[PDB]
């Protein structure tokens, strides 16, 4: 009489790799690298702001594309390729640092700084910043000499940070298309904007000149910023060519910012994003996008790495 010991097998096992072999058939195996993308921003359970045409930095200055987001509040912030920080052409100095701050900010709360003015106009506009016709950056004020070619009176304006949180303060320096047009807006002679907190002292001269047309205009307003700590004052000393802030920005809490080219979807829930969508996976590795962000599997080069979940397959 007799008894035999043995073990299972299947006609078609799965090939996997070992220390000693490439491609040994085992019974069952499973994938360890995620390749399955969900091609939408899985926004369920988070206050999501799709910035569309509003460039994230525009939330501070407030060109018209950004009117809905001037005091935005969010857990997830989505920047789009069509976004622009800007109506009257220009750029932010130290731009990417500020985006990194704002992406993290939870959104922004605005306070008036309460600058009032006399002996100047307070209301320059342009047809590149359209609302009901020629307007400007909503949070700023284009300060002009009272009438064409008039002297701009040497001014000082100061804002104390009343609040518990530190504040983002913005200003612009207008680089007019010609020394002609500079004189026309703010009068003749040297133009000096000086700015200081206690942490910060610096100085700006406009530098007028032709540059290629953007929204039809050849002038530029480059924007500057500083972080003004609680109970500290910021003081603007200036005689023209100065784009004054009306409102300071304060951060609300925390957020995560992504850049994406695909639709929001408040019905799918996820924590790892890239521009092509969301990565929902318990797997330890992903081969989808090396730049993905949030709480993600680790990017690896390899498309597949199979982990054996059964013994050697030994058929007949």
């Amino acid at each position: 009489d007799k008894i035999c010991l043995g073990h299972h097998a299947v006609s078609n096992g799965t090939k996997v790799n070992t220390l000693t072999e490439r491609g040994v058939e085992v019974v069952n195996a499973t994938e360890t690298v995620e390749r399955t993308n969900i091609p939408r921003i899985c926004s369920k359970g988070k206050r999501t702001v799709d910035l569309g045409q509003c460039g994230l930095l525009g939330t501070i200055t407030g060109p018209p594309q950004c009117d809905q987001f001037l005091e935005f509040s969010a857990d997830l912030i989505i920047e789009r390729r069509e976004g622009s920080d800007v109506c009257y052409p220009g750029k932010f100095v130290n731009e990417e640092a500020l985006r990194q701050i704002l992406r993290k900010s939870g959104g922004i709360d605005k306070e008036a700084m309460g600058f009032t003015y006399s002996g100047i106009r307070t209301n320059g506009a342009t047809s590149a910043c359209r609302r009901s016709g020629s307007s400007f950056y909503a949070e700023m004020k284009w300060l002009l000499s009272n009438t064409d070619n008039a002297a701009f009176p040497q001014m000082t304006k100061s804002y104390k940070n009343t609040r518990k949180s530190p504040a983002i303060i913005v200003w612009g320096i207008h680089h007019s298309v010609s020394t002609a047009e500079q004189t026309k807006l703010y009068g003749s002679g040297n133009k000096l904007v000086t700015v200081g907190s206690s942490n910060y002292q610096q100085s700006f001269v406009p530098s007028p000149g032709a540059r290629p047309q953007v929204n039809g205009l050849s002038g530029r307003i480059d924007f500057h910023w500083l972080i003004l700590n609680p109970n500290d004052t910021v003081t603007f000393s200036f005689n023209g060519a100065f784009i004054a802030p009306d409102r300071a920005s304060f951060l609300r809490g925390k957020s995560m910012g992504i850049q994406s080219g695909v639709q929001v979807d408040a019905d799918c829930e996820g924590d790892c994003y890239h521009s092509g969508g969301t990565i929902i996976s318990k797997l330890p590795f992903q081969n989808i996008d090396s730049r993905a962000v949030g709480k993600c599997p680790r990017y690896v080069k390899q498309r597949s790495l199979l982990l054996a979940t059964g013994m050697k397959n030994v058929p007949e």
Partner: protein, 171 residues
């Protein structure tokens, strides 16, 4: 192999054993029959499952962008970021390929272990009433009916019950 059982002295496995990973196949008076051993199966599954629970798990480390896909960052810092990222990608690709290779070698060896473990448990239950045939089978040198086979499987077989019968038959 390691352990030498699967793909070793047990030439090939069984496509018809479908209630388990390891099992018995007897032949006696009433005829052939096949049954899976739960305990050795559950031991292997539990251990492989444990590897799975250890890898299929939540990184709670948040990362944020340092880079910009739309309006590209300064070339110098960008090149450092890119160099730094690529360096880390190398590390994880290596760490991942090795993990899997090492885990797989162990998973194969572990399943081989549970086979050897079961074979040697039975060998011991049979004391001097059987002989190893070399291929994974025991020549049971005494009559072993369907109830007796069941005793071998559920680990109740009393060798001193059949010893005298078998001693004799072995000569």
């Amino acid at each position: 192999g390691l352990f030498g059982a699967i793909a070793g002295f047990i030439e090939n496995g069984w496509e018809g054993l479908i209630n388990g990973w390891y099992g018995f196949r007897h032949q006696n008076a009433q005829g052939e029959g096949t049954a899976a051993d739960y305990k050795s199966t559950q031991s292997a599954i539990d251990q492989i499952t444990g590897k799975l629970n250890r890898l299929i798990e939540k990184t709670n480390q948040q990362f944020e962008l340092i880079d910009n896909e739309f309006n590209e960052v300064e070339k110098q810092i960008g090149n450092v970021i890119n160099w730094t990222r690529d360096s880390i990608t190398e590390v994880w690709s290596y760490n991942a390929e090795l993990l899997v290779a090492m885990e797989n070698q162990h998973t194969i060896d572990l399943a081989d272990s549970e086979m050897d473990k079961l074979y040697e448990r039975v060998k011991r239950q049979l004391r001097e009433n059987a002989e190893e045939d070399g291929t994974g089978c025991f020549e049971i040198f005494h009559k072993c009916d369907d109830d007796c086979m069941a005793s071998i499987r559920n680990n109740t077989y009393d060798h001193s019950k059949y010893r005298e019968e078998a001693m004799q038959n072995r000569i």
